[PDB]
Structures are given as structure tokens and as C-alpha cells.
Design an enzyme around this catalytic site. Sequence first.
Site, mmCIF file in Angstrom:
data_model
loop_
_atom_site.group_PDB
_atom_site.id
_atom_site.type_symbol
_atom_site.label_atom_id
_atom_site.label_comp_id
_atom_site.label_asym_id
_atom_site.label_seq_id
_atom_site.Cartn_x
_atom_site.Cartn_y
_atom_site.Cartn_z
ATOM 1 N N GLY A 13 0.767 -1.229 0.000
ATOM 2 C CA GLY A 13 0.000 0.000 0.000
ATOM 3 C C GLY A 13 0.801 1.284 0.000
ATOM 4 N N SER A 44 6.929 5.267 1.898
ATOM 5 C CA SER A 44 6.821 6.382 0.960
ATOM 6 C C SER A 44 6.574 7.693 1.700
ATOM 7 C CB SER A 44 5.666 6.154 -0.026
ATOM 8 O OG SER A 44 5.995 5.221 -1.046
ATOM 9 N N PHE A 141 18.323 19.092 -6.166
ATOM 10 C CA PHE A 141 18.355 17.811 -5.483
ATOM 11 C C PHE A 141 18.747 16.723 -6.473
ATOM 12 C CE2 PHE A 141 16.328 13.992 -3.683
ATOM 13 C CZ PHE A 141 16.838 14.052 -2.396
ATOM 14 N N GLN A 255 21.804 1.061 -2.816
ATOM 15 C CA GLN A 255 22.326 2.418 -2.695
ATOM 16 C C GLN A 255 22.369 2.886 -1.249
ATOM 17 O OE1 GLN A 255 20.156 6.061 -4.176
ATOM 18 N NE2 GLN A 255 21.709 5.910 -5.795
ATOM 19 N N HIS A 257 23.079 6.128 1.686
ATOM 20 C CA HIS A 257 22.917 7.558 1.858
ATOM 21 C C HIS A 257 24.082 7.950 2.749
ATOM 22 C CE1 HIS A 257 20.314 11.252 2.095
ATOM 23 N NE2 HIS A 257 21.249 11.515 2.991
ATOM 24 N N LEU A 267 17.005 9.840 8.635
ATOM 25 C CA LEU A 267 17.542 10.669 7.576
ATOM 26 C C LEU A 267 17.659 12.167 7.816
ATOM 27 C CD1 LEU A 267 18.703 10.113 4.811
ATOM 28 C CD2 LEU A 267 16.482 10.673 3.825
ATOM 29 N N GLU A 270 19.654 15.715 2.223
ATOM 30 C CA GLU A 270 20.814 16.129 1.440
ATOM 31 C C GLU A 270 20.960 17.651 1.461
ATOM 32 O OE1 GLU A 270 21.590 14.465 -2.631
ATOM 33 O OE2 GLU A 270 21.030 16.482 -3.295
ATOM 34 N N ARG A 301 26.951 12.247 -4.351
ATOM 35 C CA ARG A 301 26.539 11.520 -3.153
ATOM 36 C C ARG A 301 27.317 10.214 -3.082
ATOM 37 N NH1 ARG A 301 20.705 9.316 -3.969
ATOM 38 N NH2 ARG A 301 21.884 8.702 -5.840
ATOM 39 N N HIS A 369 19.998 2.729 1.892
ATOM 40 C CA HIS A 369 18.880 3.654 1.683
ATOM 41 C C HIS A 369 17.854 3.251 0.638
ATOM 42 C CE1 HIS A 369 16.837 7.520 1.468
ATOM 43 N NE2 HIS A 369 17.172 7.662 0.198
ATOM 44 N N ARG A 404 20.362 4.821 -8.729
ATOM 45 C CA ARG A 404 19.161 5.600 -8.944
ATOM 46 C C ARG A 404 19.412 7.068 -8.619
ATOM 47 N NH1 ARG A 404 18.139 8.054 -3.866
ATOM 48 N NH2 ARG A 404 15.882 8.412 -3.616
HETATM 49 C C1 LIG Z 1 13.549 5.311 3.326
HETATM 50 C C2 LIG Z 1 13.499 6.616 2.562
HETATM 51 C C3 LIG Z 1 13.305 6.564 1.182
HETATM 52 C C4 LIG Z 1 13.257 7.754 0.415
HETATM 53 C C5 LIG Z 1 13.400 9.031 1.032
HETATM 54 C C6 LIG Z 1 13.592 9.078 2.448
HETATM 55 C C7 LIG Z 1 13.643 7.910 3.208
HETATM 56 C C8 LIG Z 1 13.845 7.973 4.706
HETATM 57 N N1 LIG Z 1 13.352 10.217 0.327
HETATM 58 C C9 LIG Z 1 13.168 10.158 -1.020
HETATM 59 C C10 LIG Z 1 13.097 11.381 -1.786
HETATM 60 O O1 LIG Z 1 13.186 12.482 -1.282
HETATM 61 N N2 LIG Z 1 12.916 11.260 -3.146
HETATM 62 C C11 LIG Z 1 12.797 9.987 -3.781
HETATM 63 O O2 LIG Z 1 12.650 9.994 -4.955
HETATM 64 N N3 LIG Z 1 12.843 8.844 -3.084
HETATM 65 C C12 LIG Z 1 13.023 8.882 -1.735
HETATM 66 N N4 LIG Z 1 13.058 7.736 -1.003
HETATM 67 C C13 LIG Z 1 12.860 6.369 -1.523
HETATM 68 C C14 LIG Z 1 11.323 6.359 -1.881
HETATM 69 O O3 LIG Z 1 10.562 7.036 -0.870
HETATM 70 C C15 LIG Z 1 10.862 4.936 -2.101
HETATM 71 O O4 LIG Z 1 11.613 4.243 -3.099
HETATM 72 C C16 LIG Z 1 9.351 4.909 -2.441
HETATM 73 O O5 LIG Z 1 8.528 5.644 -1.504
HETATM 74 C C17 LIG Z 1 8.952 3.431 -2.505
HETATM 75 O O6 LIG Z 1 7.395 3.308 -2.756
HETATM 76 P P1 LIG Z 1 6.754 1.926 -2.800
HETATM 77 O O7 LIG Z 1 5.303 2.216 -3.152
HETATM 78 O O8 LIG Z 1 7.429 1.087 -3.708
HETATM 79 O O9 LIG Z 1 6.895 1.233 -1.487
HETATM 80 P P2 LIG Z 1 6.585 1.594 0.034
HETATM 81 O O10 LIG Z 1 6.085 2.867 0.126
HETATM 82 O O11 LIG Z 1 7.740 1.170 0.876
HETATM 83 O O12 LIG Z 1 5.481 0.612 0.455
HETATM 84 C C18 LIG Z 1 5.621 -0.850 0.511
HETATM 85 C C19 LIG Z 1 4.232 -1.405 0.953
HETATM 86 O O13 LIG Z 1 4.305 -2.863 0.915
HETATM 87 C C20 LIG Z 1 3.585 -3.370 2.089
HETATM 88 N N5 LIG Z 1 4.122 -4.715 2.210
HETATM 89 C C21 LIG Z 1 5.453 -5.085 2.237
HETATM 90 N N6 LIG Z 1 5.609 -6.399 2.345
HETATM 91 C C22 LIG Z 1 4.339 -6.904 2.389
HETATM 92 C C23 LIG Z 1 3.835 -8.281 2.496
HETATM 93 N N7 LIG Z 1 4.604 -9.341 2.570
HETATM 94 N N8 LIG Z 1 2.457 -8.396 2.512
HETATM 95 C C24 LIG Z 1 1.620 -7.319 2.438
HETATM 96 N N9 LIG Z 1 1.996 -6.031 2.336
HETATM 97 C C25 LIG Z 1 3.370 -5.871 2.314
HETATM 98 C C26 LIG Z 1 3.919 -2.391 3.157
HETATM 99 O O14 LIG Z 1 3.053 -2.467 4.261
HETATM 100 C C27 LIG Z 1 3.723 -1.062 2.389
HETATM 101 O O15 LIG Z 1 2.450 -0.512 2.451
HETATM 102 O O1 LIG Z 2 18.414 13.461 1.541
HETATM 103 C C1 LIG Z 2 17.212 13.148 1.344
HETATM 104 O O2 LIG Z 2 16.236 13.872 1.793
HETATM 105 C C2 LIG Z 2 16.861 12.122 0.312
HETATM 106 C C3 LIG Z 2 17.851 11.462 -0.400
HETATM 107 C C4 LIG Z 2 17.537 10.433 -1.461
HETATM 108 O O3 LIG Z 2 16.352 10.148 -1.731
HETATM 109 O O4 LIG Z 2 18.558 9.914 -2.026
#
Ligand SMILES: *Cc1cc2c(cc1C)nc1c(=O)[nH]c(=O)nc-1n2C[C@H](O)[C@H](O)[C@H](O)COP(=O)(O)OP(=O)(O)OC[C@H]1O[C@@H](n2cnc3c(N)ncnc32)[C@H](O)[C@@H]1O
Ligand SMILES: O=C(O)/C=C/C(=O)O
Lengths: 655, 655
Positions: A13, A44, A141, A255, A257, A267, A270, A301, A369, A404
Site C-alpha cells: 500500500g 513512501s 536535489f 544504494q 545515503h 535521515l 541532502e 553523493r 537507503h 538511482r
Molecule cells: C527510506 C526513505 C526513502 C526515500 C526518502 C527518504 C527515506 C527515509 N526520500 C526520497 C526522496 O526524497 N525522493 C525519492 O525519490 N525517493 C526517496 N526515497 C525512496 C522512496 O521514498 C521509495 O523508493 C518509495 O517511496 C517506494 O514506494 P513503494 O510504493 O514502492 O513502497 P513503500 O512505500 O515502501 O510501500 C511498501 C508497501 O508494501 C507493504 N508490504 C510489504 N511487504 C508486504 C507483504 N509481505 N504483505 C503485504 N503487504 C506488504 C507495506 O506495508 C507497504 O504498504
Molecule cells: O536526503 C534526502 O532527503 C533524500 C535522499 C535520497 O532520496 O537519495
Amino acid sequence: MKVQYCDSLVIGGGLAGLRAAVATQQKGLSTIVLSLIPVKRSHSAAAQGGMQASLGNSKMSDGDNEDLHFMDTVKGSDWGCDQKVARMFVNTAPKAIRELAAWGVPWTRIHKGDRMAIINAQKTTITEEDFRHGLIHSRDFGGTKKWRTCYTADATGHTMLFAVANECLKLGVSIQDRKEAIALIHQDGKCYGAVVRDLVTGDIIAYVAKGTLIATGGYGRIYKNTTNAVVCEGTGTAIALETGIAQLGNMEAVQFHPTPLFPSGILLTEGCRGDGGILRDVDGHRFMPDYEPEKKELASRDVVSRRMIEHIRKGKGVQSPYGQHLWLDISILGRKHIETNLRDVQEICEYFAGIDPAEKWAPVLPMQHYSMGGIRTDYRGEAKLKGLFSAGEAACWDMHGFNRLGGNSVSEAVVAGMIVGEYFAEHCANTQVDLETKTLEKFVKGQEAYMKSLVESKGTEDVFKIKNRMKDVMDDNVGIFRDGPHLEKAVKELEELYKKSKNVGIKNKRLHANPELEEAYRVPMMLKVALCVAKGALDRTESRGAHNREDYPKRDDINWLNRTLASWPNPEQTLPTLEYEALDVNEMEIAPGYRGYGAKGNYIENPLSVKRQEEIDKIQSELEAAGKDRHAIQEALMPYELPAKYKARNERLGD
Amino acid sequence: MKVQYCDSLVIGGGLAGLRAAVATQQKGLSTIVLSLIPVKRSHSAAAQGGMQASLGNSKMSDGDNEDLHFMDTVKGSDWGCDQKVARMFVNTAPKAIRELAAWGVPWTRIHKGDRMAIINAQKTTITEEDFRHGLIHSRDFGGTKKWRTCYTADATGHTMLFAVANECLKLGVSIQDRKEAIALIHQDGKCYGAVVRDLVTGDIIAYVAKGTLIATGGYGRIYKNTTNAVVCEGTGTAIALETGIAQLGNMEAVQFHPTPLFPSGILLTEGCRGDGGILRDVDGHRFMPDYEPEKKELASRDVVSRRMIEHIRKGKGVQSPYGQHLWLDISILGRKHIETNLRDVQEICEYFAGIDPAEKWAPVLPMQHYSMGGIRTDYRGEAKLKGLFSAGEAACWDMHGFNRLGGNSVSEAVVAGMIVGEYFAEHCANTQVDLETKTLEKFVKGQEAYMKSLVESKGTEDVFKIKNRMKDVMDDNVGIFRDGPHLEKAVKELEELYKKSKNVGIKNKRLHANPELEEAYRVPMMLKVALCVAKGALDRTESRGAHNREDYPKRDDINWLNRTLASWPNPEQTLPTLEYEALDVNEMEIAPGYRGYGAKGNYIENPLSVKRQEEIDKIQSELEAAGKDRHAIQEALMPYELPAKYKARNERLGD
Ligand SMILES: *Cc1cc2c(cc1C)nc1c(=O)[nH]c(=O)nc-1n2C[C@H](O)[C@H](O)[C@H](O)COP(=O)(O)OP(=O)(O)OC[C@H]1O[C@@H](n2cnc3c(N)ncnc32)[C@H](O)[C@@H]1O
Ligand SMILES: O=C(O)/C=C/C(=O)O
Ligand SMILES: *Cc1cc2c(cc1C)nc1c(=O)[nH]c(=O)nc-1n2C[C@H](O)[C@H](O)[C@H](O)COP(=O)(O)OP(=O)(O)OC[C@H]1O[C@@H](n2cnc3c(N)ncnc32)[C@H](O)[C@@H]1O
Ligand SMILES: O=C(O)/C=C/C(=O)O
Ligand code: NA
Ligand code: NA
């Protein structure tokens, strides 16, 4: 037996899962979104950097378009990405931003006038013309020349996730949380759904659907130090791997951070370094200039993380009960500047580090990260297992390759949600499934028996001790710097850890709401994922993007211009099966070359690259001479596919 | 598409459906019970006579056992029943009563002492010994020599239905009301569930299951005058018929009740006549003695109805704006007797007839009451369409033949619920289904298209006018007395009515909660059911049980010792296809003979009957001479099957 049917089953989700669910539900397909947690709490939500999209609204974004975003993405990937996919992405990112703006996402807007901005080359003033007033803004960024990162103040991921989740509620999507997919149902090479464990009741249920999409996020938690939420454990990756048919792509491509807060991993954007933040060592010495006389802290980075570790290995790290680290000093930016532009980072350091960044330095250390690796799909988002799709960080659609771009991952989540969503919708509406109860029963009874075996196990191993050892191994041997000898050691210990995971014993015997039982089945899955990462790193004898081999420091375009494909066909094997998908240079719009960051000539040139390059220069010259636009030229170099709904061009301020 | 899955799907929430659901749910099979109305409002709730079971507790029940109940049942059926089934029934009825007593059904109990009772041969006093005190009582009902009809005061059906419904709630059965099965899903000769219309929302849903059981009750409402609830329209019968594979048995076998209140049809229990009630004509003349000098008003129910109509045709009926009728006089039984033993009938006459039975006479006329015909099944309850089972009044398990015993139908509902329930449970747990979404979609889209066609029809026919004409035709031509000429006329008009039903137009266009749309699709179904009844009566040239042909007054054991099987293979045909299943005399425990009620020698003897009879007398003599018990003798004459759970003997007061 408990069975739930829907036309489109979405596992995950986050931004990717929820956006894909919007795509299917809007065309009348009954869709269910399963999630471990309430969807608005997905990882997310933590994105604060922003989302990359070539709008070209602001002064520093002037002239930006699909081609520039494309080039940044491909070169950033160190040529490990599928260029056709990257094209699909860059052309759709602008529409994703605009659709989200229409859904109420409060993107920060441009206001006319001069602006106190940091450029770090000419930190002069920036002026925004009147015709730009009120349009979506962008900031610096991801190291891109053209500032194209859009944001909603300091909580971009948060507002984006909420808007998409709300659209799902508007459309009547069935959102079912505290539900975990623990196995995929498949027969004859086709996916018919998933076996799900209700985290609250312990019930094992079969969710059948004409199509299943996994958007479960990254697998960062296999590492001890990570910026990831505690739920980013890659179980989604594992269930795909455990079918023995779906393959995982570039799992070794992880990757890091450079500035997460140590040792929590919370976090510190940046923007700290981009605004003038200074990295210091144990003696308070500003060290980046010593390694990067030119770029200094403003270096790539990728480069900063490497230097930080190098400096630590030289013995200049700060000793701590949790390990060694370095210092981040932003107090030098002034108190007034921090309480207006970095008010968020200030709260973080105070709330968790118990310090005021305007007075004291923040402990930092590079940490895991983002997960470039994931479930391998074609350009449509479909995996080798038919009817199984993947999108978001959980996939290897591969627009990222081995590195990425900052800002491209939240962008990909929504974009893939849109594109894969359309193809996923088409598949679900056009395919016809043959649901055999014999098969459903086999998978459901198989997992009920498994839960029972875990609860009755008289094993003496401790699941947490095993999990913690796995995380230490990954951090110590599969981090920023890797080498064969240590990787061999890691693969051996991980394999040993996997075998011991089967002798785990738990205290709490209940089948419902049992966090101990949860770890009992999740850890073995994580270990298999870790093995794909570790073994993939061991066998890839080259240095590409984020994968750095000290014993093989050069990028090898001759023997390694490919993608690692991991599988686990035999449930008895204790190591993953690795195969390789070769990247056809003839289908690249941009032939392999210098990535821009790092040492030059640090790559073994491939003859085929030279041929293609010439062929490209030729095609460009001829077409450009005949007064042909960038669009027709792009088509002649590398045509790509896009759902009819998104094949339209992006209007920009200045057409 | 909306799809619901369960292991065991039960269509119908009466005694039969709910008891079967208990059977499947108790062994862990997920089961759903669908019903037009809250289940406790099913027609079963109206039974006031009682339930037949050979307990042998009371003085007038002394010596009763399975053999006596069996003989009453077979002879009552005029030999049209499957004797093996009748055996399964009689041996299980005692356990049904005792299980219900254990579930709290408040059966009236015996108290020691003398009792003022009516016997009508020696209306003396009856004494109940001390060892009989507190056991389940029984009364005179159904014309059986041994009083074996059990009851809970004056609301037996009510208490029985409530107990079974409550057990379903206890077990977690999914009870879903205001849900109507409008079509069965089938492929390759197997039933995979049903297409259901949600009466409230109008949603069309597919309920898939490994096994489906239809326990939808009788089809009495195809008649203008009936004792049946307004929901007893036989749509359950029709959906089975519309598969073109399942067959309907003896649809022409319809039973009438002699004393329903006119013209409402509200039942005035047989106890009125049994206690001394008197039937009078237009001049107040007690007429039964004229036709039955011996038995008089205490004659066979079958005979009373016939005489009443005969008397009316002789011109002695009472003229009324609703038609002709006769009078029921119970005032002669005394006011004190009515306000203690018939307090219920008193309330009925006052509440609806606006009269006090202790002072004025009640208007009565024979009316349709029970449907012996139904979905044809084997002894296990399975129809020709594999995976489709039927139980209760909706089925032709055929323990009734051409005349069901009073008190045997509520008994059969629970007994079949138990027995067919076990076989149904076994089928659902052992079979494996192949659910093709292509097939599900075809059936679901097929019904959505149908609802749309009804709502958009520009036809000018009025659905109610058509339905009412159908009911008049049935009452006028397919009642107590039938003949070829009138039946031919009925079949022709019904066929014409069916064709016009397709040109029906409705005013209310909504798809939800629309009673007009409901009639639009139900009436065509009722017409097809009516055609099976009418055509079956026309082609059966003999008089058997409740089917009386004035032009063929004799029972023909030579050419008609069989069962009528109706089908509708071609959806284009406008008449039902009729075939016949021959009854093998060699498998009968009781060879064809005199039924006990009516004229003697009124049946064309079959040579094979004589042979078998001798063979029976021989086997009985030899075995009885060797000191063999009734059980071993029964086995040698006609062995029958019974689920392991019910193969035990019934303990009785006196073993
Ligand atoms: C960790 C992070 C990543 C990040 C960021 C800052 C942080 C602290 N800042 C970013 C930024 O400024 N710009 C950017 O482009 N990317 C940035 N990132 C990475 C980015 O946020 C992520 O790559 C992106 O949000 C990933 O989205 P995605 O929709 O793929 O995944 P998710 O949000 O993690 O949600 C995963 C969902 O899956 C459910 N789940 C997981 N395993 C299961 C199982 N087995 N069964 C059922 N559900 C499952 C989770 O509950 C969740 O809802
Ligand atoms: O520094 C941050 O806020 C995010 C970095 C990244 O998505 O690589
Ligand atoms: C009418 C009547 C019958 C009767 C009786 C008195 C009256 C007024 N007194 C009896 C007595 O004293 N002793 C006896 O042995 N029998 C007596 N009877 C007849 C007897 O009550 C019935 O034969 C018996 O109750 C029938 O039980 P059964 O379980 O078979 O059926 P039901 O109770 O009528 O319930 C039918 C259910 O089916 C649902 N339904 C019908 N069509 C559909 C569709 N299309 N979709 C979904 N559900 C459907 C009905 O809603 C109901 O719940
Ligand atoms: O008279 C009644 O109460 C019931 C009669 C029957 O079931 O036949
Ligand atoms: Na990924
Ligand atoms: Na019947």
C-alpha cells in the site's frame, strides 16, 4: 477454506501499489490492496527530498525537458538500466506531478521576484519572472544541472501518499491492512493470487485474482544500518523468489545515503550538504576538501559515502559504543538559516539525537537507503511468472540500473503505478483464469501446516539472534566497499544462518497476533533475499554504480554489461541460482561512456559501444540537418512503448 | 465482477436448508445460506400439525416402530415413492426429534394419568403410565393408526425452525438474506454455484462453491388458492430446470388441503375435523355422511377434498364474490373445548375471517398445500447435474410419491437436512472444482444483460395480469379433478402466457429494491414450472394418489408405475420435455396393492407385482421361522443405504 476473489490483487500500500489500484478500480475492476500496515504509514511517507519531473517552470528549471532528465537517469545508472523504460518514465513524470496537483497535493509554488538561493558556483540571487508565478516550483536535489525536484515543503512523500490513498478511498478500493502475503499461488507458470496471513486473527486466506501486483517496497532491513522503516524487509521480494519461476534483478545493487543520523538511521536530508553543511572527523577536521579539492562536500553523493568510509578506515573516525562515525556540522550555516530552511532537520536532531544542530554537530555514517534490485519485469511490469506484475521499489523495471537518481524513486513509484497500472488493468480485463480448488487448497493447507510447524518446533535457535547476525554480516561485508574474500565469507555465513533459521523455537504458541511467529517465518525469507544480494555481489567482478569491488575497481562493459537474474527453482538448494541478461547496446539511445562522477577512464570500453556511438552521431546529424525535431530524432534512435492514455506530449511554459 | 466463495452453498433458509448447513459447517466447511427473506420467516414456520416420527412413547404410540411408519408412508404414496428412500427416512426421523429436543425444541410432554381424548371409534379415556411421564408426546394426525405426530403445542414448525436457525448462528454459518438465486452456474455437467441478485442493491453476484444445495420449498403459488406463503413460487425449481440438465420429478403430483379458510387460504388445522368438526353445505346440511356413511368427516383427507368439490359441482356450494365454498362448523364442539384445545383456530377465524368459530361457521374450500414434485435426486440427494443437491419440499427425493403423509413433510425437511447434509458434506470435502472465470463472467454478464433488457423493454404486457391469469388457469384446470380436454386447454393457454411474459413492460426503471422487476423475471420462471405441472398431468393417463383423472379413474400399475421426469434442454422450446423413470418392483419391500383409502380394485394390477408379493411372503416366512428379527428380514427384502453417522438403531421405551 477461506477464499477472497477480486479482479486485481495489489500487494503493498505504498505510492506504487495505491496508484496501480486507482488504475484498475477506475475501469471497473474489483481491486483489493493488501498491506502489513495502514497504507498511509508506508515508507513512501518519509520522502522529504522531493520528486523529479521535467516541468521546466522555474528559472533554474528553464529549458528542462524529457531528454535532459533521460540523460541524467541513464548516465546515473552507469548504463545498467533499460533505456526504453527510462524513456517511458521521463515522459510520464510530468503528467504524474500534474495529476497529483489536480488531486490536491500542495506543491510549493513559485512567487515572482528575487530569491536568496545557494548555487555553490555563484551563490547569487535568483529571479523568477511574472509568467512563472503560481506554477509548481523545483529545487536543487539529486545532483542534476537542471533543478527539477518538485516538493510540498518538507513532507513530499507524505502529501503524495495521502492524496493517492484518498483517491483509493474515493473509488471504493478495498484496503485491507494488517494482512501479509506469505506465498504466491501459481500453477502452469501463471500467478493466480496469494496466500495471506491475517496478522490479527492468524487466519490463513487465499486471495485469488486474474492478476497480482507486488509493490512491497525495498529490502533495506536485511542491513543493520538502514534509513528504511522497520517493515522494509523484502518479504514481497521473497514470496516472488519462492515461486521458483519469477526472477530477481540486480539484488546486489543497493544504494547508500551518506548522512543518515548515527546510529538510528533517521535521515538528515541532502539539503544539509547542499546548503553548505560541513563534514568533520574526530579532530573536527573538514576532510572532504582533502579528497575532493574541487567538488568538496558538494561532490557526488556516491563519492561522499566512499570518502567518508575511506577517512574512517584511515583511523580518523569517531569512536562510539555503537560503532565509528563522523560529524555533520550545519551550525556554520547560521541559526537563522536553520530555523527557516532547515527547521525540520533541527527538530530531528533535537527529538532523537538530543541536540541543536545550530550549536552542536550531528553524528552521521553512510547507511543503506534504496533498493535498485527487485522483482524482474518486462517494460509492462510483468514478471516471468505470468499474471504477476511488480512496480515501485520492489521491482527491477530497471530505469535505475546500478544507481538511482535522488528524487527518481518516489517519481518511479507513481509513474510505474500509472503505467504498469494500465498494463496490469488490461491484463486483468483480458485474461481468463482457471481457478482449481485443488491448487488453492494445496497452497492454503501448505501454509497452515507451516505455521503449525513453527509453533510446535522444539528447535533451540533464537530467531532474533539469527536476524541480528544476518544484519551485521550484511553491513560488514556487503556495504559501500566490497571484495571477493569478505563476500565469500558473507555468503558462507548467510547460508549457515539460513540453515539454522529452520531450527528456530518460539515461546508464544498462539496463532493470532504473534510478533514472535511473524519473525519465525519472515527471517528465513530475508536470509534468502540476503543471499541473492551477497552472492550477486560476489559473482559480479566489476565496479558499477553503487556496487564497488576493491579487487575489481573498473566498470567492465565487455563482460558485465548485463543484469543479474536470481532465482530459486529448487526449494532444496541453499544458494540462489544466478543467470545474466545481456544489455543490447544496439537498443540504447545513449551508448556506454563516462558517467560524470568519479575517476575517468575507469571503465573497460566495449568495441560495440564505439560502433553504436558513431551510428548515433550519424543518425542525429542527418536528421538534425533535415530540420527534424528532437522527437523524431528520439524515435529514430530508440523507439519505446507507452499506454495510449499517456502517449501525449507534455506542454511546457515556453511552447 | 463480484464473486463470493464458500465450500458449501445452500440456497434456501427453511428447515431443510438450515439443517443441511449445520451438517456442512460442523465439519469445517465454510458454508453460506442464501434466502429471499430472514430464515426464521420461511414457510416451515407455519406448520401447526406436527412432525411424524416413530418414538412409541405414549399409550396411543405403543408398539410403533420403523416398519409401521414405513408401511404408512409407502401405501400413502400409492406406490409412487422410492421405498429405499422411505426406509432411510423412517429410521432417521426418531433421531431428528431427539436431536431437536437436545437443541431446546419444547416438545409437549406426556404426564401420567387419565386423559379426555377423542378416538372416534371409542372416544373413551386414555391413560399414560408412570414410566411414560416426561417423554415426548404424540397426537392423532395424518390418519395413521399409531399416533406418532410430535408437536410443541400449536407452533411446531415455528419452534423447530428457530432451533435450527439458532444452531446455524451458533456455528457461524453465513446467513445472507434478501438474496435471490436467479440462475445456476454450470459447465461440463457440473454445478459450480449460482448467480445471485441482491434484492436490496440490485447487484448481480456469483456465488461459487464445490457443492450447491437447493432447499427452496414448494411451488404452491402458481395456484390462485394455496395455503403457501407468498414466497413459495418455485423459482428454486425453475433455476434447476433452466440448466437444461437437472430434471424435475412428478411435478403433476400436488396435494390439496380440504379445510383452508376461504378465500385467504389461511390454514385451519386438521384437528378441527379430527375433534368432531362438521362440514356443511349451502343449506346447512351435513353432507359427508351422504358420501361416506361409515368414515364421514373422519374420512381420508384425500377423500374429503374430493367429496367437497363433488358436492359443490352438484350445486350445493355457497355462492361468494370470490367463488364458491362450503362451511366448517366447530361451534358444535362447545365453546369451552375451542378455547382450550382449539384456541389457535379461534384466533385465526376472528383475526382474519372476523368470526368466532364457537358461534359462527367458517368458510372453507380445498386448496393447494404441498408439492410432492421437485428437483429429482438420487438417494444421496444429488441431482443429474453433478454437485447440485436438493432437499426438503423442493426435492423429489421421493419418499412421498403421489401422496405425502400429513406430518411427514416437516419431518422430511429435517431428516433430509441431516442425511443429504452428510452426503453433501462428503461431496464438498472430497470433490475438486475447476472454476473458470470465463464461465463465471458469462453467467454473471448474462444476468446483468437480462435485468437490463427487462428494465428497457418497451413491451405492453402487464406482469401482474399475466401472473394472475396463470394462477386462475392452474386452479380451474389442474386441481383436485382433472381431465384431458381441460388439461389440453390449460397447457395451451399457459404456453401462450409464457410467450407473452417476454413482452412485459415495467414502470419502475431502477435496478435496486424493485418489486416490479422481481415479478418481471420470476413470472416467466413460474410459467415454466406450471407447464411441467400441467403437461405432466395431461400426459399421465391414470389416477394415482393426489393426481385424479376423471377420464382415467384407475391406478395403472402396468403402464404408469413410474416417475415423471421433466427437463428443458433447449432454451428455445416452449413446452417441457417429459421422460419416465420406471419403478422396479423387484426392489420394493412392499409390492403394489390396495392403498387403504378410496374404492377397492380401482387399480390395474401388474403381473410383476404378484410375483414379487409371493417372493416377499416366502422370504418372510422362511426367515421368521428361523427366529429372525424384523431387522434381518428387512435387510433380506430391500437393503438400503445410510450415512455412517445415522446407521444406529433407535432405542425405545420397552426394549
Ligand atoms: C527510506 C526513505 C526513502 C526515500 C526518502 C527518504 C527515506 C527515509 N526520500 C526520497 C526522496 O526524497 N525522493 C525519492 O525519490 N525517493 C526517496 N526515497 C525512496 C522512496 O521514498 C521509495 O523508493 C518509495 O517511496 C517506494 O514506494 P513503494 O510504493 O514502492 O513502497 P513503500 O512505500 O515502501 O510501500 C511498501 C508497501 O508494501 C507493504 N508490504 C510489504 N511487504 C508486504 C507483504 N509481505 N504483505 C503485504 N503487504 C506488504 C507495506 O506495508 C507497504 O504498504
Ligand atoms: O536526503 C534526502 O532527503 C533524500 C535522499 C535520497 O532520496 O537519495
Ligand atoms: C404451507 C404449510 C405447510 C405445512 C403446514 C402448514 C402450512 C400452512 N403444516 C405442516 C405440518 O403440520 N406437518 C408437516 O409435516 N408439514 C406441514 N407443512 C408442509 C411443511 O411445512 C413444508 O413441506 C416444510 O416446512 C418445507 O421446508 P423447506 O425447508 O423445504 O422449505 P421452506 O421452509 O419453504 O423454505 C424455503 C426457503 O427457500 C428460500 N428461497 C426460495 N426460493 C429462493 C430463491 N430463488 N433464492 C433464494 N432463496 C430462495 C426461501 O426464502 C426460504 O427460506
Ligand atoms: O391441518 C394441518 O394443520 C396440517 C395439514 C398437513 O400438513 O397436511
Ligand atoms: Na528496486
Ligand atoms: Na417435493
